[PDB]
Amino acid sequence: MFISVLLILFALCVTLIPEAHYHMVRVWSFVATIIPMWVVTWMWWNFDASGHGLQMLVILGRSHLAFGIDGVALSLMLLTTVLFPICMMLLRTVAGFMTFILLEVLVLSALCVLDLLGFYILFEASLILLFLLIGRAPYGSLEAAYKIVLYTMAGSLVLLPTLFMIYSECGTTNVLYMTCAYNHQTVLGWGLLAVLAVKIPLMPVHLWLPEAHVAAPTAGSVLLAGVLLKLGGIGFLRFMLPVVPEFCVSVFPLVSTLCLVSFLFSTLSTLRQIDLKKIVAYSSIAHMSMVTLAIFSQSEFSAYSSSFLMIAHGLISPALFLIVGILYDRAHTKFILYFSGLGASMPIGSTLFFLFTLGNLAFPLFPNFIAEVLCMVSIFAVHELLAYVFCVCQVLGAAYGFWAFNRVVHGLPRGPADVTRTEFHTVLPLLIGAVWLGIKPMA
Amino acid sequence: GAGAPVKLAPRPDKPLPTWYELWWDNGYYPGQPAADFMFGAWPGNMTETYYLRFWSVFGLALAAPFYYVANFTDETRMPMVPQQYPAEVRDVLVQRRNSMLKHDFSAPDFKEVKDRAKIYWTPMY
Amino acid sequence: EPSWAKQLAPKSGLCPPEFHYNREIWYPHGGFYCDPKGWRKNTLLTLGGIGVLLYMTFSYSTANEVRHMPPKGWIPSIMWNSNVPDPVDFRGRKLNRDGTLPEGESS
Amino acid sequence: VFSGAFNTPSSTTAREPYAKTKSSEAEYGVDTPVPASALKAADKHDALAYAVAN
Amino acid sequence: EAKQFTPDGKYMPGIFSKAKPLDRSTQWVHKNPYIEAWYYRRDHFENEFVWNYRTTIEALWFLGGFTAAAYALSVFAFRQADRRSGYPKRQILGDEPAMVLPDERQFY
Amino acid sequence: SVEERQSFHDKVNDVFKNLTGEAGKRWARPDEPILHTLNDEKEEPHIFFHNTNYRTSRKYINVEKTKILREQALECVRAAGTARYHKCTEVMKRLQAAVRVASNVDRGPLARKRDVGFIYHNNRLRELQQQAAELEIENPFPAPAKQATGGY
Amino acid sequence: ADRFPPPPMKATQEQMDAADVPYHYRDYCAHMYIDYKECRLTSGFSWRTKCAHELHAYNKCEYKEFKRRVAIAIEEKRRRGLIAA
Amino acid sequence: TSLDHVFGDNSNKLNYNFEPMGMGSLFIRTMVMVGVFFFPVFIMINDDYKYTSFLDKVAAAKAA
Ligand SMILES: CCCCCCCCCCCCCCCCCC(=O)O[C@@H](COC(=O)CCCCCCCCCCCCCCC)COP(=O)(O)OCC[N+](C)(C)C
């Protein structure tokens, strides 16, 4: 807590640096995100895996805002602290540095909060930052920014009275006493489903993602894909399943059909896309549908497998966004028809593209393979057909993945030259994390 | 011989069709459909009606003998019984539904072993 | 000619003289008709490193091989491995480590 | 509380229904009366009179 | 034939120089007008939606049809799981009061 | 009554307030659960968290039991060779029973009961054969198997 | 199979476990199979000439069993009426 | 155009209108695809029906 105050105050000192010292501004904003990565690694060192489920607790009196660490929050916090310095390497202005610093404060505090009102306050305080990040004046899109902000606001406004309903019902929004009291679970369950089915892209409230994740800059796309979608999953695992479990059983056919149609229809839409960033953007919806069904199965080790799929997606899809961002930065287009023969002109970039293509399709020696196997073990244990639907549709994911790769990488060599040292080192931590988590993830 | 000449494919100089992503233009001449034989003339000028018409006879010409022997012929056509085993060896060998020893019509539990070799799909509870 | 073109390798003697291939591109495997000058020395050194890896994996394999059944005769792994059990033949008789029947039924 | 193995509130339930909770020392309501027009307008047994009332 | 670096490093911008400097926009693509038009049209394809015959029929049989198929399959899987676990009929949303949430202190 | 429930809650709060433990023991890996006659154990939060920790301990121990038995069964089968059909049925049965306990105890609210031996299926086949005999019609089902796997 | 009863087994379970006889080869010629396998697996390239006797004896035993199987089938069909007697 | 006299020219154009398939053809082929690629669903539904009709026969002839 004292450490967190010191890290925030060190991060906020970027504004006071005079702008004529360019080197100092770059180094200060990069170190301001490097330090929380070290602190979260130390928190992993301090964790007792044979101890209590909630460790390193702190509660700030009668102000809500109570905090604690479990395994899902700790893995997601480690992933966020990895992803934020890479975002710092892709920005050039103090406005970008400050927006991403404020976003990192809000994400890190939202991932480990234990109060529902605290979760509401901390998460969607990032709405105006996302609006300004997506609708930036010369190269953004105001339509996309309006869509993402309005969908998130709609879901949050459905949740807010139900939050206050359980608060008047039992006397607290602390999740440890909300899980032990008697509450009207249908109303609160519908409010929580309303927020987290927009955060996780679940059809029909999913149309904001294709616009926002493409109109964003490369750093914004890395953040939005790798981090902000998983707040819906940790919302399911931390707040909704412990507090309204009767609802979570009774809504299972509806959540199940939403997940199945989201998976199938989003995979079918990904095949007709002609923009590389839109191809990468749609593929995330099917993965999150598998995550949601694995969470809702509650069957074998469902929290473990679903968290592991969230980590595998958060490693693999930001790297695909990084490669598309390199192509866009040095060729000024994201259109497939302008790219051919990238193997001959960018051999290192095409090799990285192929490896992350194989990772996104859940091939072995990548963490997505272990993730999808364990998620389908959790789904299979409820019924065999709910697993069969995901199993037989694997040709549809590989079709779009290999079609996009084969169209842009082979053929007549036209396009930009190979990657620089900076682009390679933006990609590199994700590759090392993927090789480790896909070969020896546990000990 | 690397470096052989190859003709390049022209760029679009007219308005594009709405569903243009069904043509694969890799840069060289000629391009192809996204999947072969989805449009354009088929090899030998055959059509789908040709293959469906020939298959509507040819498929029953191949499925005819299997049906005849599976419904009008049985284990007793053979001039000998299956391979004989001691009881302790046989009793585990015929536990497999896969085994060819269930066609032993001279076994004292021939019917019961055949009734246990019925394929099921959903495991009951 | 550009300034940096003098720093580049020529097209090798393996490459056909009329083939053009953009010599500025760094290929991770070597590229178009790679033929470095000191290749025989590098080949010998890489063969030495491969021999080091061969010895390391031979030792690791010998340390971690588990035989749940004794062999039915002499096997060549008896020469370098001391965890190989004594052979027991097809009739169940215990044998020597060189694969011959012990005294009492030999010759 | 939070483990990757299972979710304990998903299987920790009451075995019997509960009794009614006593909330106050006085258990009678106080409210203003409904006007008779709305009392009549709620009745659905006569479809014509329901339509005429609404 | 530009010179953007001194012999000891030290990048030079070449703002007033005659020779064209190599920079970030050196390999930007030359835009084909028809490709840009087609991508713009596909970007705004929601203006081309119309409730004609084919749109209504395909939105009924495929979208609503497969959504109903997936709901029926989900209910089938739920009921079969409850039967193969020793449970009675369980209360889904809109199904009258029944059993939800098995007790861990109970043998089924 | 309400007074007795309140006095029990006060006693539980006092006990869990003045609780300590040392010498190599982790709290939240308790040796025994707290035995109660409460309707809905979540009425008392300390008892609910204590029994949650005990139940987590048991789930992980059962997983470990499955791994130890799988190593033992592998040793038996690989030593036996072609004699494995009559030599290692008992250890295979014990491994399958341990997997059954590891899956079916504290299973969650939705997963079906896992039969590692096809034992529920063949038990059902036995009962359906017996019912069809009294019904005096032909059995539409397969006859029950004596053993389906290398264990059961 | 009462008219043509099986011969006694000349190989015990322990002998077939010691030779690692595959369980579908543990029939009424298993001892000859043990002899043939023991000869062939230790004779190398020239197994067809120096293990000719063991293979010939094993095939002769299997011929006896084949003839008994034909006779069992003939008796079963005669009892069912499929072949006139 | 320097190789058009060697490999052919660009005068002959592709004869395809890039139009969607007919509605009935699409519906029929999709129904065939659902039947072929989702055959475990139909197998298990048939299993449930054959099981519940036997229990109907048992409950009918038992209480008489
Ligand atoms: C719900 C459980 C959490 C599992 C989430 C999945 C994690 C993804 C990767 C799997 C790694 C498994 C690690 C196992 C041993 C590590 C310590 C451990 O035990 O895990 C911790 C938590 O583990 C972690 O935090 C793992 C961190 C994984 C995140 C890795 C991604 C970030 C790295 C990015 C790439 C960096 C490259 C940099 C190099 C250039 C606690 O989990 P449980 O054992 O379930 O807790 C016990 C429960 N109870 C206390 C109640 C008894």
Q: How much is the CA Rg of chain A, to the nearest whole Å?
A: 21
Tell if the CB–CB gap between A407 and B28 is shorter than 8 Å. Answer: no
CB D27 within 8 A of CB F75: no
> For residue F139, which of A308, A133, G63, B124 has the smallest C-alpha distance?
B124
HSE-up (13 A, CA, CB side) for residue D15: 10
- Give C-chain residues touching G14 at CB under 8 angstroms: 92
Tell if the CB–CB gap between A299 and F42 is shorter than 8 Å. Answer: no
| Element of type H or E holding A58 | strand A55-59
Angle at F4 between CA E107 and CA F5, to 5 degrees: 50
CB A173 within 8 A of CB A163: yes
Q: How many CB atoms lie within 10 A of CB H13?
A: 6
Residue written as token pair 């469906």: B52
- Whole-angstrom Cα distance, residue G61 to residue G46? 23
- Whole-angstrom Cα distance, residue A432 to residue A410? 26
HSE-up (13 A, CA, CB side) for residue A45: 6
For residue B64 the two structure tokens come to: 């005819």
- Give B-chain residues touching E86 at CB under 8 angstroms: 125
Q: Give the ranges where A171-275 is alpha helix by DSSP (H).
A: 175-178, 185-199, 208-215, 218-223, 230-235, 241-243, 245-250, 252-270
CB A305 within 8 A of CB A375: yes
For residue C54 the two structure tokens come to: 């061969």
State the DSSP code for A340.
B
Beta bridge partners of A335: A275
Which amino acid residue places its CA nearest to atom 35 of ligand 1? Answer: A433
Three-state DSSP class for A293? helix
> For residue A290, which of A180, A376, A402, A206 has the smallest C-alpha distance?
A376
- Whole-angstrom Cα distance, residue A323 to residue A360? 14
For ligand 1, whether the C-beta of A435 sits within 6 Å is: no
Amino acid at A425: H
Ligand 1 mutation pick, A38, A43, A80, A311, max ligand atoms within 8 A of CB: A311
CB A124 within 8 A of CB A152: yes
**DSSP letter string over A302-335?**
HHHHHHHHHHHHHHHHHHHHHHHHHHHHHHS--B
Interface-testing mutation among H45, H50, H52, H55, with chain E (most E C-beta atoms within 10 A): H45
Angle at A384 between CA A310 and CA H43, to 5 degrees: 145
The values of phi and psi at residue A356, to 5°, are -75, -25
For residue C10 the two structure tokens come to: 């020529």
- Give E-chain residues touching D12 at CB under 8 angstroms: 103-104
Sign of the four-CA dihedral B39, B44, B48, B51: negative
For ligand 1, whether the C-beta of A341 sits within 6 Å is: no
C-alpha A299 chain-centroid distance: 24
- Whole-angstrom Cα distance, residue B124 to residue B101? 26
- Whole-angstrom Cα distance, residue A93 to residue B115? 78
C40: which residues sit within 8 A by CB, 6+ positions away? none
10 Å CB burial of residue C76 (0-12, 13-18, 19+) is exposed
Sign of the four-CA dihedral E8, E13, E15, E20: positive
- Tell which B residues from 3 to 22 touch E, by Cβ distance under 8 Å: 11-16, 18, 20
Does the CB of D19 have a partner CB in chain A at under 8 Å?
Answer: no
- Give E-chain residues touching D15 at CB under 8 angstroms: 103, 105-106
The values of phi and psi at residue A98, to 5°, are -70, -40
E15: which residues sit within 8 A by CB, 6+ positions away? none
**DSSP letter string over chain D?**
---SS--GGGS---SSPPPPPP--S------PPPPHHHHHHT--SSHHHHHHH-
- Whole-angstrom Cα distance, residue F49 to residue F28? 8
Pick from D4, D5, D9: CB nearest A245: D9
What distance in angstroms lies between residue E37's CA and the mean position of ligand 1's atoms?
48
- Tell which D residues from 25 to 54 touch F, by Cβ distance under 8 Å: none
CB A360 within 8 A of CB A316: yes
For ligand 1, whether the C-beta of A71 sits within 6 Å is: yes
Tell if the CB–CB gap between C28 and A344 is shorter than 8 Å. Answer: no
- Whole-angstrom Cα distance, residue A341 to residue C8? 23
E98: left (phi over 0), alpha (psi -120 to 50) or beta: beta
CB A205 within 8 A of CB A155: yes
Beta bridge partners of E6: E9
> For residue A294, which of A201, A212, A373 has the smallest C-alpha distance?
A373
| Residue A318 vs residues A78, B20, F132: alpha-carbon distances, Å | 15, 29, 61
**DSSP letter string over A421-441?**
HHHHHHHHHHHHHHHHHHHS-
Gaps in chain C with C–N over 2.5 Å, residue before each: none
- Whole-angstrom Cα distance, residue B99 to residue B112? 14
> For residue G70, which of B103, B75, B82, B80 has the smallest C-alpha distance?
B80
Tell if the CB–CB gap between E74 and A256 is shorter than 8 Å. Answer: yes
| Residue H55 vs residues D22, F120, F121, F135, H62: alpha-carbon distances, Å | 49, 17, 16, 11, 10
Amino acid at A2: F
Angle at A94 between CA A89 and CA A98, to 5 degrees: 85
**DSSP letter string over F54-84?**
HHHHHHHHHHHHHHHHHHHHHHHHHHHGGGH
> For residue A408, which of A316, A331, A312 has the smallest C-alpha distance?
A331
- Whole-angstrom Cα distance, residue A154 to residue A234? 20
End-to-end CA distance of chain C: 88
A110: which residues sit within 8 A by CB, 6+ positions away? A119, A122, A123, A231
- Whole-angstrom Cα distance, residue F99 to residue A376? 19
> For residue A433, which of A387, A353, A385, A366 has the smallest C-alpha distance?
A366
Which amino acid residue places its CA nearest to atom 47 of ligand 1? Answer: A49
Beta bridge partners of A414: A340
Chain D closest-CA separation from residue E106 CA (Å): 9
The values of phi and psi at residue C79, to 5°, are -65, -40
Tell me, yes or no, whether chains E and F touch by having 3 or more C-beta pairs under 8 A: yes
A164: which residues sit within 8 A by CB, 6+ positions away? none
Q: Give the ranges where chain F is alpha helix by DSSP (H).
A: 2-17, 45-80, 84-87, 89-104, 119-135
Residue of G nearest to B79 (CA): G70
- Whole-angstrom Cα distance, residue A386 to residue A298? 14
CB E34 within 8 A of CB B17: no
Tell if the CB–CB gap between B119 and F142 is shorter than 8 Å. Answer: yes
H1: which residues sit within 8 A by CB, 6+ positions away? H9
D48: which residues sit within 8 A by CB, 6+ positions away? none
- Whole-angstrom Cα distance, residue F16 to residue F39? 20
10 Å CB burial of residue A401 (0-12, 13-18, 19+) is buried
Given resolution (angstroms): 2.5
B39: which residues sit within 8 A by CB, 6+ positions away? B22, B33, H16
Which amino acid residue places its CA nearest to atom 14 of ligand 1? Answer: A442
- Whole-angstrom Cα distance, residue G32 to residue A300? 52
| Residue A238 vs residues A48, A312, F112: alpha-carbon distances, Å | 19, 20, 24
- Tell which E residues from 18 to 37 touch B, by Cβ distance under 8 Å: 32, 34-35, 37
Chain E closest-CA separation from residue F39 CA (Å): 11
For residue F99 the two structure tokens come to: 């997997």
> For residue F143, which of F130, F85, F135 has the smallest C-alpha distance?
F130
CB A415 within 8 A of CB A340: yes
For ligand 1, whether the C-beta of A432 sits within 6 Å is: yes
Which experimental method was this entry solved with? Answer: cryo-EM
Q: Dihedral through CA H17, CA H19, CA H23, CA H25, nearest 10?
A: 60
Does the CB of E80 have a partner CB in chain H at under 8 Å?
Answer: yes
Tell if the CB–CB gap between A412 and B8 is shorter than 8 Å. Answer: yes
Does the CB of E108 have a partner CB in chain D at under 8 Å?
Answer: no
CB D11 within 8 A of CB D23: no
What's the per-residue H, E or C state across chain B?
Answer: CCCCCCCECCCCCCCCCCCCCCEECCCECCCEECCCCCCCCCHHHCCHHHHHHHHHHHHHHHHHHHHHHHHHCCHHHCCCCCCCCCHHHHHHHCCCCCCHHHHCCCCCCHHHHHHHCCCCCCCCC
B104: which residues sit within 8 A by CB, 6+ positions away? B81, B82, B110
Does the CB of A420 have a partner CB in chain C at under 8 Å?
Answer: no
For ligand 1, whether the C-beta of A353 sits within 6 Å is: no
What distance in angstroms lies between residue A112's CA and the mean position of ligand 1's atoms?
15
CB B105 within 8 A of CB B75: yes
- Whole-angstrom Cα distance, residue A348 to residue A417? 10
**Count, residues in chain A:** 443
Residue of D nearest to E105 (CA): D12
Chain B closest-CA separation from residue E101 CA (Å): 21
Tell if the CB–CB gap between B16 and E84 is shorter than 8 Å. Answer: no
Residue of B nearest to E37 (CA): B15
For ligand 1, whether the C-beta of A183 sits within 6 Å is: no
**DSSP letter string over A275-288?**
BHHHHHHHHHHHHH
- Give F-chain residues touching C68 at CB under 8 angstroms: 75, 78-79
Q: How many CB atoms lie within 10 A of CB E68?
A: 11
What distance in angstroms lies between residue C106's CA and the mean position of ligand 1's atoms?
63
C-alpha A385 chain-centroid distance: 28
Pick from F85, F115, F142: CB nearest B118: F142
Does the CB of C68 have a partner CB in chain G at under 8 Å?
Answer: no
> For residue A315, which of A34, A42, A83 has the smallest C-alpha distance?
A83
Angle (deg, nearest 10), helices G52-80 and G30-41: 150
- Whole-angstrom Cα distance, residue H56 to residue A252? 29
**Count, residues in chain D:** 54
| Residue D40 vs residues D34, D36, D49, E28: alpha-carbon distances, Å | 10, 6, 9, 77
- Beta strands at E5-6 and A55-59: parallel, antiparallel or unpaired: unpaired
Amino acid at F133: A
Residue written as token pair 């979760």: A119
What's the per-residue H, E or C state across C31-51?
Answer: CCCCCCCCHHHHHHHHHHHHH
Residue written as token pair 């519940």: H52
The values of phi and psi at residue F66, to 5°, are -60, -40
- Whole-angstrom Cα distance, residue C78 to residue C80? 6
